[PDB]
Enzyme design. Structure first.
Site, PDB file in Angstrom:
ATOM      1  N   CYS D  91      -8.455   4.424  -1.299  1.00 18.90           N
ATOM      2  CA  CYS D  91      -8.705   3.475  -2.276  1.00 18.90           C
ATOM      3  C   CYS D  91      -7.513   2.223  -2.424  1.00 18.90           C
ATOM      4  O   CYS D  91      -7.908   1.251  -2.502  1.00 18.90           O
ATOM      5  CB  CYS D  91      -9.178   3.996  -3.519  1.00 18.90           C
ATOM      6  N   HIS D  92      -6.302   2.744  -2.349  1.00 15.72           N
ATOM      7  CA  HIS D  92      -5.307   1.843  -2.602  1.00 15.72           C
ATOM      8  C   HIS D  92      -4.022   2.395  -1.764  1.00 15.72           C
ATOM      9  O   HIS D  92      -3.011   1.977  -2.330  1.00 15.72           O
ATOM     10  CB  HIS D  92      -4.992   1.807  -4.402  1.00 15.72           C
ATOM     11  N   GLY D  93      -4.381   3.307  -0.961  1.00 15.70           N
ATOM     12  CA  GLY D  93      -3.204   3.737  -0.048  1.00 15.70           C
ATOM     13  C   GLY D  93      -2.080   4.630  -0.675  1.00 15.70           C
ATOM     14  O   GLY D  93      -0.963   4.598  -0.507  1.00 15.70           O
TER      15      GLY D  93
END
Ligand code: HEC
Ligand code: HEM
Ligand code: HEM
Ligand SMILES: COc1c(O)c(C)c(C/C=C(\C)CC/C=C(\C)CC/C=C(/C)CC/C=C(\C)CC/C=C(\C)CCC=C(C)C)c(O)c1OC
Lengths: 21, 64, 76, 109, 236, 17, 373
Positions: D91-93
């Site tokens: 999703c966002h690392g």
């Protein structure tokens, strides 16, 4: 006083809730 | 001993139920009175039933 | 809106302050006698129909009851 | 005329001054209190209606129960991927170590 | 036949259900009525009451293994239940019931009392009103004469007799005691909130008795002004 | 008006609980 | 301020007659109720599904588990009953005091009634009980009476050969919209009325005596709201099933039917009328006219006095009309057998003859007594 009228009333409703509940 | 039975009996003893029973007895006797007839008595049966039952509830639940 | 409603003239309209008039005029004491008067006046024209109705309902119920009532003699 | 008719007698309605006013206010106050009392009750219950090196999860209690040998926005971290040999959330690392500790990225805890 | 009146205690306006009986009626259902009837919408959690707290319900929750749990394929019945487990069903399929009920249907009894006109009475009457068929009675299949029953051919097998079961409380298990007790439970389940509500209603009556004369007094304050207005016509 | 802020706050606490 | 001007123009500085009785409260009560029905309907819609599969269940869940569901559901049902009580008293006020001479307000009015009636059937059919199912089939079949396009229309509404899931889901939307619909139509009502102002029980021009609404008819509406809430909560919290039919708690037996099937009380008479006319079509038409006769009412006013305060013969005829309306409400309940039928037939004949024939003739006679005709 009008403002205090509402104020005490709000507080009155405040406690009455607990008592009545 | 089911109080229901006892109370039912008791109510029947009530003169009101006694008379209602009188009707039923006369009427159930009437059931057997004639054959080709349609004297089912369900009506009179119900008549006594309800009357007695009212008395029953009037004095059963408390025993219950 | 208020103003420009009707050409009402010479109709003095005195009034009294709310906090000056007794807070709650007795209703049962004073008003209901007149209420009784009011109701009795019209009831004399209101209940008559219902008077008739109740009768209809009562007669109908028992009538229907007898209707259902079967005669041992019937089919006897 | 101007003076011919004196004010009619309202005594019939007239009550026996600030005390009278206070009493009337007291009434309004109590009624407001009553309204409010009901309000807390109604609103509360009113609102109350809407009230109720490998990893493996069994959806315990309706949530993924990671068992192994996102603090950020709630996705599923992907096991056996990432730069910390533990987890990675696509999703966002966010990279979680095998301990599940956020090591890199924007995941808060 | 119009079922007569009956003095149910809970029915009292401000009074509530007697859980003890309710409990007793849940036993009666568990030991007798559950073989053809099931409280589907009722769960052990729903079953909770003074009659049975969650703890007791848990016992009952663990007391069952029927359809509480499924297997590799979720078929037949495969595992016991717990608190969330809903009430067990005597039949996994309507046909099953139909089959084991003369082809007829033993209705789950969750809302049964609500369903029947004058239910509480009806129930009591039906369970204890088979009476006597004086004539013209031809019960076809597993039927039982009962004038209280609409057709006097109930087919609801009379399942209660003196000491039909044994109340754990020890209250004599007379047919009527049994009938009345289960009635309470059935009623309790049909309206799991009967008691909850009546308390609200009592608070509502007290609050309206406080608030109606006060709002009437305000209205009569603000309307007194006009109600005292004296009009006079003074043509010049 | 100053007390109104205060009044509302008081009732707010009650209602919010 | 252009938003506060309309609010002031319709609720604060609106010139209202000083002598209007409590009846005039009832319409405001209706607005409050609609709000209640709608808001309750929302929660009822919440935790609810239009699926025959889960419609009856989640509702039982509402009755059993939904937080305060039992309260919101029975408030919704008894608020529909309170809506029809206030609606009937509002229409009776309009008939008695000659308020139908406000013709546009009355027509928005008569339409409003049909709509509210439908919302009832809507709300009614939605829980998917035994009684809902068999009630829906019945009235839907009413449509089949139509001479040529009837069958199609019925099938259309049903959405299939017979009411089934297809119906439940669509009836759900109408019952979610008609409420919104009626709401607006009411707004039209208020506009078409302020152009003319409200009527007074004397029926005279009250322009000489008008007062504000904020301090005089607002606290009065607040008191009426409080009394209506008292009756609604004693209907919900103490006798929650005195107006319903227990059949509701029976999941619809697509197969079986309630030995005794009856439409709800509010419409009981309506159907009573149907039961009376032998011909199916006749019944449907008369039924419709039953409601529509009202719309027809402003063209039947033949008196020089607007209200019935000074008209005793037409007062007697009005109370006879209320009497046989109550009789038709009772008959609908009674089953099909002697002598309930004859009463029904007469009561319907008397209802239509009093509204159509007897009141204008009586108004002509009353005008003749005052040396006006
Ligand atoms: C061993 C069998 C059996 C037991 C035990 C039993 N029932 Fe039934 N019951 C039936 C069958 C079979 C039917 C279906 C009858 C029918 O559909 O015509 C039925 C139907 C009913 C109905 C539906 C009648 C109606 O009014 O529509 C009620 C109510 C009912 N039972 C109540 C009870 C109650 C209350 C108990 C115990 C407290 C009970 N039953 C125990 C077999 C049973
Ligand atoms: C837009 C607002 C509304 C919504 C969302 C709504 C929604 C619903 C829902 C979901 C139900 C089913 C739950 C239940 O069984 O009670 C229902 C039932 C019902 N509604 Fe409505 N409704 C609304 C407005 C109305 C109005 C205005 C009326 C009155 C005309 C009405 C009358 C009914 C009735 C009579 C029932 C059946 C109640 C019962 O089961 O006995 N509703 N509503
Ligand atoms: C949706 C249902 C309805 C609502 C919500 C509603 C609402 C209202 C409201 C708020 C008023 C103004 C208050 C009042 O006059 O007392 C009013 C007035 C009126 N309504 Fe209705 N109404 C409805 C249905 C009807 C129907 C069906 C009729 C016709 C029988 C009707 C006839 C009137 C009349 C004649 C007035 C003016 C009465 C007067 O002020 O003298 N209304 N309505
Ligand atoms: C003669 O004086 C009046 C009056 O001027 C008005 C506007 C109304 C309308 C008052 C209302 C409160 C409207 C109805 C209330 C609603 C909530 C309407 C609901 C409909 C919606 C679309 C919302 C009256 O009821 C009334 O008589 C007392």
């Amino acid at each position: 006083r009008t403002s205090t009228f509402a104020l005490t009333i709000a507080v009155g409703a405040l406690f009455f809730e607990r008592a009545f509940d | 001993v089911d109080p229901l039975t006892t109370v039912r009996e008791h109510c029947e003893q009530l003169e009101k139920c006694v008379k209602a029973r009188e009707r039923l007895e006369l009427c159930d006797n009437r059931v057997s009175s004639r054959s080709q007839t349609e004297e089912d008595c369900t009506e009179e049966l119900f008549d006594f039933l309800h009357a007695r039952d009212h008395c029953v509830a009037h004095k059963l639940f408390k025993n219950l | 809106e208020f103003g420009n409603l009707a050409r009402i003239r010479h109709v003095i309209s005195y009034s009294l302050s709310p906090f000056e008039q007794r807070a709650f005029p007795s209703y049962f004491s004073k008003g209901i006698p007149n209420v009784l008067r009011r109701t009795r006046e019209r009831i004399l024209r209101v209940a008559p129909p219902f008077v008739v109705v109740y009768l209809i309902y009562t007669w109908g119920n028992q009538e229907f009851e007898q209707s259902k009532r079967k005669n041992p003699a019937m089919y006897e | 005329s101007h003076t011919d008719v004196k004010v009619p007698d309202f005594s019939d309605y007239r009550r026996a001054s600030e005390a009278r006013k206070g009493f009337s206010y007291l009434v309004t106050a109590t009624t407001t209190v009553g309204v409010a009392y009901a309000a807390k009750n109604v609103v509360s219950q009113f609102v109350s209606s809407m009230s109720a090196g490998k990893n493996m999860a069994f959806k315990w209690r309706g949530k993924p129960l990671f068992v192994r040998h996102c603090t950020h926005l709630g996705c599923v971290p992907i096991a056996n991927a990432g730069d910390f040999g533990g987890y990675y959330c696509p999703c966002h690392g966010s990279h979680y170590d095998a301990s599940g500790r956020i090591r890199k990225g924007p995941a808060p805890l | 036949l119009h079922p007569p009146s009956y003095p149910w205690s809970h029915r009292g306006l401000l009074s509530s259900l007697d859980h003890t009986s309710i409990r007793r009626g849940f036993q009666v259902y568990k030991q007798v009525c559950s073989s053809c009837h099931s409280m589907d919408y009722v769960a052990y959690r729903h079953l909770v009451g003074v009659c049975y707290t969650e703890e007791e319900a848990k016992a009952l929750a663990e007391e069952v293994e029927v359809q509480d749990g499924p297997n590799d394929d979720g078929e037949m019945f495969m595992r016991p239940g717990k608190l969330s487990d809903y009430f067990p069903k005597p039949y996994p399929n309507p046909e099953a019931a139909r089959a084991a009920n003369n082809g007829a249907l033993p209705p789950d009894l969750s809302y049964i009392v609500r369903a029947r006109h004058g239910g509480e009475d009806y129930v009591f009457s039906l369970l204890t009103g088979y009476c006597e068929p004086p004539t013209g009675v031809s019960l076809r299949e597993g039927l039982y004469f009962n004038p209280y029953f609409p057709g006097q051919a109930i087919g609801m097998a009379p399942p209660i007799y003196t000491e039909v079961l044994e109340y754990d409380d020890g209250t004599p298990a007379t047919m009527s005691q049994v009938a009345k007790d289960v009635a309470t439970f059935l009623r309790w389940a049909s309206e799991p909130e009967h008691d909850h509500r009546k308390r609200m209603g009592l608070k509502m009556l007290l609050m309206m008795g406080l608030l109606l004369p006060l709002t009437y007094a305000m209205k009569r304050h603000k309307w007194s002004v006009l109600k005292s207005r004296k009009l006079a016509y003074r043509p010049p | 008006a100053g007390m109104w802020g205060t009044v509302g706050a008081v009732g707010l606490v009650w209602a919010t609980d | 301020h252009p938003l506060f001007k309309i609010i002031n123009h319709s609720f604060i500085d609106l010139p209202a007659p000083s002598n209007i009785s409590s009846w005039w409260n009832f319409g405001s009560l209706l607005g409050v109720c609609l709000m209640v029905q709608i808001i309750t309907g929302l929660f009822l819609a919440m935790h609810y599904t239009s699926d025959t599969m889960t419609a009856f269940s989640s509702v039982t869940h509402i009755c059993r588990d939904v937080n305060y569901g039992w309260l919101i559901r029975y408030m919704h049902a008894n608020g529909a009953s309170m809506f029809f009580i206030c609606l009937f008293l509002h229409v009776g006020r309009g008939l008695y005091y000659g308020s139908y001479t406000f013709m546009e307000t009355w027509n928005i009015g008569v339409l409003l009634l049909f709509a509210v009636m439908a919302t009832a059937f809507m709300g009614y059919v939605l829980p998917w009980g035994q009684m809902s199912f068999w009630g829906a089939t019945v009235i839907t079949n009413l449509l089949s009476a139509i001479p040529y396009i009837g069958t199609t229309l019925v099938e259309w509404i049903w959405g299939g050969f017979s009411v089934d899931k297809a119906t439940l889901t669509r009836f759900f939307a109408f019952h979610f919209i008609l409420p919104f619909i009626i709401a607006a139509l009411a707004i039209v009502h208020l506009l078409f009325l302020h152009e003319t102002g409200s009527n007074n029980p004397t029926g005279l021009n009250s322009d000489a005596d008008k007062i504000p609404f904020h301090p005089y008819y607002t606290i009065k509406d607040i008191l009426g709201i409080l009394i209506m809430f008292l009756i609604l909560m004693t209907l919900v919290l103490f006798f929650p099933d005195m107006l319903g039919d227990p059949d509701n708690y029976m999941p619809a037996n697509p197969l079986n039917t309630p030995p005794h099937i009856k439409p709800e009380w509010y419409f009981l008479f309506a159907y009573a009328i149907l039961r009376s006319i032998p011909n199916k079509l006749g019944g449907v038409l008369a039924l419709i006219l039953s409601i529509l006769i009202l719309a027809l009412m402003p063209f039947l006013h033949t008196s020089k006095q607007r209200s019935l305060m000074f008209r005793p013969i037409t007062q007697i005829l009005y109370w006879i009309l209320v009497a046989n309306l109550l009789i038709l409400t009772w008959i609908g309940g009674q089953p099909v057998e002697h002598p309930f039928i004859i009463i029904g037939q007469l009561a319907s004949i008397s209802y239509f003859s009093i509204i159509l024939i007897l009141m204008p003739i009586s108004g002509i006679i009353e005008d003749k007594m005052l040396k006006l005709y």
